[PDB]
Amino acid sequence: TASPHALANRLRQLAYRVRSLSS
Amino acid sequence: ASPHALANRLRQLAYRVRSLSS
Amino acid sequence: SPSALADELEQLAYEVEHLSS
Amino acid sequence: SPSALADELEQLAYEVEHLSS
């Protein structure tokens, strides 16, 4: 199981990709 | 927040993300 | 794609459920 | 809103960071 910190960092990278979306 | 509450909020937002465009 | 992103968000949510308070 | 969703996900990342294994 990934650590809370690794999961949090993954979630921040996904948030950057969401921010880059257009709608 | 519990792991459950965070996971459910993530799934809620996942649906909203699904509805966006590239 | 947004669907691919949403799929990864849901996978992340699954993993978050395995964590503890 | 993409930026609003991103802000919410970042706040969720803040919460996940403060969980335990």
Experimental method: X-ray
CA distance B19 to A18: 11
What's this structure's resolution in Å? 1.5
Q: Which chains touch A (3 or more CB pairs under 8 A)?
A: B, C, D
Q: What is the DSSP string of D1-21?
A: -HHHHHHHHHHHHHHHHTSB-
Q: Closest-CA residue in chain C for D20?
A: C20
Query: What is the spatial distance between Cα C16 and Cα B13, in angstroms, rounded to a whole number?
Result: 14
Question: Whats the size of chain C, residue-wise?
Answer: 21
Compute the distance between CA of residue C13 and CA of residue C16 in angstroms, rounded to an integer. 5
Residues with Cβ within 8 Å of A4's Cβ and at least 6 positions away in sequence, in order, are C19, D16, D17, D18, D19, D20, D21
Q: Cα–Cα distance between B8 and A16 in angstroms, integer?
A: 20
